[PDB]
Design a protein around this nucleic acid. Structure first.
Ligand code: FES
Ligand SMILES: [Mg+2]
Ligand SMILES: [Mg+2]
Ligand SMILES: [Mg+2]
Lengths: 110, 21, 51, 215, 108, 168, 71
RNA sequence: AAUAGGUUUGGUCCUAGCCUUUCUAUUAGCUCUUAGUAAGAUUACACAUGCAAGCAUCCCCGUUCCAGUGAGUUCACCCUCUAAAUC
RNA sequence: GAUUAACCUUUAGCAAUAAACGAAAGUUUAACUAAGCUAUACUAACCCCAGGGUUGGUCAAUUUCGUGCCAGCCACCGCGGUCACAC
RNA sequence: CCCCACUAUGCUUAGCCCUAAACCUCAACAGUUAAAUCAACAAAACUGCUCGCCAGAACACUACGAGCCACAGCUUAAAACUCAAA
RNA sequence: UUUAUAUAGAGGAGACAAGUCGUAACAUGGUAAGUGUACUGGAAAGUGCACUUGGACG
């Protein structure tokens, strides 16, 4: 559990898969503008270890901080692909969905 | 030629007289 | 305890959603019946005119 | 005899006429008020300043507004209005706050009979525009009784000095509504950036809250 | 400007305040290279007493000598301060009377 | 006036009204919602109103929004232990959503009061120092004690300039 | 409206074109010298790149093109 | 940036800059009685002279601190881990 | 010393506190303490002991002369060619 | 300025140049006609949202830098001195 | 060895005695004005092509 990496858990968007076994993820945090008091997204690039190369450019993934940085920039491991790109499984119902419409209705399995 | 004072800059002493009495 | 309560609330909301989905699917079945009633006549008229 | 007259501006308007060329005339803006909520203002054009004064005040006494005053010392609610290119933001203030307003507004408020008020003037500081916009805003304000009659509800005043005691300042004269007014968690109002900055304390100003003579 | 544009550009940046003829200093020691008179711009008509002096910064500049009468000559040490001479274009320095070799204004 | 609809949202007085303060376990909160839909309306208004306040009260919690990804809006909190808390928010108004998340993950008022007491315990009243930290800068402020020489000069006997004369 | 701003712009442009016509040869020579300096500085930057990289000379088969010449 | 004010014109309205009024600091002129307190080279330019680190039954310890300067400059803060140091 | 518009004494004591050392009495310390210099600021006093700036408008406040677009003045607008509330 | 003759040019083919008072001098999208309709004029007044742009005048459709098939060029675009206006 | 790198012919901007010179602009400003571009002219400008009304009209 103890780790030297600051961000222990981060949900981000994969924006790169070119590196071997390492996905380039973009993580956006709300930041308060001190002058406008409005929250704006600030995006930071992280490198996540992906042993199975299951990350596709564009899916939403969850990254868990590694106990130690396995590389210069690789400090996190791909914990879970929260939303596969174009293959979202609706967590509320468990059925697959394509945008705001169900591919399989929740009533289908009754 | 000679200087010609601006019409808008001419002093008025009516207020001085009114405040005096 | 809070996690169990949240899961119970999720189950209750899922049941309500299932009921709402059943009602909406019956309504959509009626709407599709009306749409097919219109479309069959439209296509029959178009095909007869083309023939 | 109950009315007092105060000059707001005197201007030497020069008109170009066919024969005499530049002709001098005096345009004077005056305000008259009895100190009991009845006040007005007028413009007077003349060749002599005293004739302009006489014309302006004798005409302003015929154009009297009536400014409703909360507790006979301040306005009923915060006002923010733009007349032409002049923005006037007046804030209702408690007793003893005094008049912290543009000097013309201070004069007009003394004529009306307002003792406590705040006022910031932005945009053009045209004296006539400021004066008549001020009169418009003061005249169009809605009293607590009018609000209670409109919405059919008790207008309850909450004072920090009086603790949680609810003070009813106005009750509708007709039937009283039974359904509570909807309590939106987020009101939809247009705030002022200056007011928000002042409340948050970021409104650093070397000119705000400067000690000044009694008003 | 929209809120997004304001956030992108950030708060407005104060322009760098321009240093005056004194380079941001209340006074400057100078050596009077020469003295002469300058005609003020119209409509003012006069012969303003001025002197070119070399400042302690190495720059040479024209300074205005106020008062009536002066013993200022070449190689005399003076102290110059800011404050433009209104009727003289380009003269943005004034000699402090009574300091260094600049004797006080000789009365009468 | 202040730009934008509902400018009150951009005031510290409003951002500080978030009653929801997450426990230390919460690290990530994902808000999936749909930009259109009568059922998701409350969730939408939640994102319009409560996401700022929450983020103000929990600066170290990563909040990330997702528009029109699932047919139904929902929150999904991630805890430090690895647990994922899925909270369906369909048909719920924004106030109800805030109440629910406060109940299931927000700190109780007792914990907040205890933390406030802990914070207040740091500034001991009896300490003396700069006004930034202590209530008083010197003991001379306390009445009865010998006052500051800058205000009331000390007697010549108590001043070293004449204690040295007594030494002579 | 009046065209005082437009007239001032027109006069400025006329004066600028007159100045260019008067000294077009000197301007052309200055521009040629500037292009020469530009190419020299670009070549020096590339040389600095491959020198810091550790290569004792330019890579095999590499010649810096004259990217700042009309020809 | 204000409770604002002066200033464009023959005149008005608007936009706009400049300046005024307020509060500090340094320097300068002129002037200056006492007492208490606080603060105090322009210069990372060059330094005469004097002093500023000793202690102690020897070994050790200390002179790496305090004091000084602001030349340089995202080493100052949080977390993880873990030396030296103290108990 | 030089330099800059910028200018503290070639004082005293380890009595207090802090540091170093010692088992300790103690010892040392230009740290510090107590003084010296300076209207840079704050506080207090004056019984005899007040000067500096300003007085066209903004902006509180000018009598009489002299000067005559000269000499000069201004923060901004501006004043001065014979009777200047602006020198 | 007028008359006559005549050339580049207006035309075609293939490249280049990339400018305009390129102006409805009205950014795009959505909504409103209720308030206060509203500095003025132009063209009734506004609201929501987004992008672009401006922060006294002149210096300046300039200088330098950079880019461009452009080589008396175009795009981007200053500062110093000066004024109390524009 | 060219360039970099430390001043110095020459240009440009503003002001100065300022008026002289042309009368281009403001009136249908004496030939409506202007944008872009090109050629001619030492220059004051003139003309070609398109556009604009920020001109007029039976
Ligand atoms: S500050 Fe307390 S005695 Fe001076
Ligand atoms: Mg020009
Ligand atoms: Mg067109
Ligand atoms: Mg657009």
């Amino acid at each position: 559990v103890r780790s030297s990496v600051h961000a222990r858990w981060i949900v981000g968007k994969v924006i790169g898969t070119k590196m071997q076994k390492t996905a380039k993820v973009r993580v956006t945090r709300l930041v308060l503008d001190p002058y406008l008091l409005k929250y704006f997204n600030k995006r930071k690039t992280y490198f996540a270890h992906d042993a199975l190369q299951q990350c596709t450019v564009g899916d939403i993934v969850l990254l868990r901080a590694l106990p130690v940085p396995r590389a210069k920039h690789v400090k996190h491991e791909l914990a879970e692909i929260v939303f596969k790109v174009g293959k979202v499984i609706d967590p509320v119902t468990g059925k697959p969905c394509a945008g705001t419409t169900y591919l399989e209705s929740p009533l289908s399995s009754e | 030629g000679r200087k010609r004072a601006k019409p808008r800059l001419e002093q008025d002493s009516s207020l001085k007289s009114y405040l005096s009495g | 305890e809070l996690m169990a309560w949240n899961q119970a609330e999720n189950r209750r909301l899922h049941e309500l959603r299932i009921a709402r989905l059943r009602q909406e699917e019956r309504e959509q079945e009626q709407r599709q019946a009306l749409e097919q009633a219109r479309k069959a006549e439209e296509v029959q008229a178009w095909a007869q005119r083309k023939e | 005899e109950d009315f007092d007259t105060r000059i707001l501006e005197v201007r030497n308007v020069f008109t170009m006429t066919a024969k005499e060329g530049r002709k001098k005339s005096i345009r004077v803006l005056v305000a008259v008020g009895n100190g009991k909520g009845a006040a007005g203002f007028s413009i007077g054009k003349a060749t002599d300043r005293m004739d302009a004064f006489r014309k302006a005040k004798n005409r302003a006494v015929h154009h009297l507004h009536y400014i409703e005053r909360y507790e006979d010392h301040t306005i009923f609610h915060d006002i923010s209005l733009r007349f032409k290119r002049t923005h006037i933001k007046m804030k209702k203030q408690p007793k003893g706050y005094g008049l912290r307003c543009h000097r013309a507004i201070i004069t007009i408020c003394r004529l009306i009979g307002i003792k406590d008020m705040y006022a910031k003037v932005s945009g053009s500081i045209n004296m006539l525009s400021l004066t008549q916009g001020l009169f418009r805003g003061l005249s169009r304000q809605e009293t607590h009784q009018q609000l209670a009659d409109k919405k059919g509800l008790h207008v309850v005043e909450i004072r920090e000095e009086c603790g949680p005691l609810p003070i009813v300042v106005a009750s509708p004269r007709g039937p009283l509504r039974k359904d509570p007014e909807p309590e939106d968690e987020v009101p939809d109002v247009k705030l002022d950036w200056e007011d928000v900055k002042t409340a948050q304390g970021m409104k650093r100003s070397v000119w705000s809250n400067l000690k000044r003579a009694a008003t | 400007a929209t809120l997004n544009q304001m956030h992108r550009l950030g708060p407005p940046k104060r322009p760098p305040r321009k240093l005056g003829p004194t380079e941001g200093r209340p006074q400057l020691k100078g050596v009077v290279l020469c003295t002469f008179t300058r005609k003020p711009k119209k409509p003012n008509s006069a012969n303003r007493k001025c002197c070119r002096v070399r400042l302690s910064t190495g720059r040479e500049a024209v300074c205005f000598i106020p008062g009536e009468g002066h013993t200022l000559q070449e190689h005399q040490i003076v102290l110059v301060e800011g404050g433009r001479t209104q009727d003289l274009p380009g003269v943005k320095l004034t000699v402090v009377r009574g300091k260094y070799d600049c004797g006080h204004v000789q009365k009468k | 006036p202040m730009k934008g609809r509902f400018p009150i949202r951009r005031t510290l007085q409003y951002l500080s009204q978030g009653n929801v303060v997450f426990k230390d376990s919460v690290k990530v909160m994902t808000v999936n919602y749909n930009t259109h839909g009568e059922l998701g309306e409350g969730a939408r208004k939640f994102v319009f109103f409560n996401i700022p306040q929450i983020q103000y009260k929990n600066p170290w919690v990563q909040i990330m929004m997702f528009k029109n990804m699932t047919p139904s809006p929902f929150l999904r909190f991630y805890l430090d232990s690895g647990e994922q808390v899925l909270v369906d928010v369909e048909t719920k108004s924004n106030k109800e959503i805030m109440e629910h998340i406060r109940k299931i993950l927000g700190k109780n008022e007792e914990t907040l009061r205890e933390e406030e007491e802990e914070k207040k315990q740091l500034s001991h009243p009896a300490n003396f120092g700069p006004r930034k930290y202590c209530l008083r800068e010197c003991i001379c402020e306390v009445e009865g004690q010998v006052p500051c020489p800058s205000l009331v000069p000390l007697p010549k006997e108590m001043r070293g300039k004449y204690k040295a004369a007594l030494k002579a | 409206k009046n065209v005082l701003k437009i007239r001032r712009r027109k006069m400025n442009h006329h004066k600028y074109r007159k100045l260019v016509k008067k000294t077009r040869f000197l301007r052309r020579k200055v521009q040629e010298g500037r292009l020469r300096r530009k190419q020299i500085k670009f070549e020096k930057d590339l040389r600095r790149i491959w020198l810091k990289a550790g290569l004792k000379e330019a890579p095999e088969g590499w010649q810096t093109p004259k990217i700042y010449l009309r020809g």
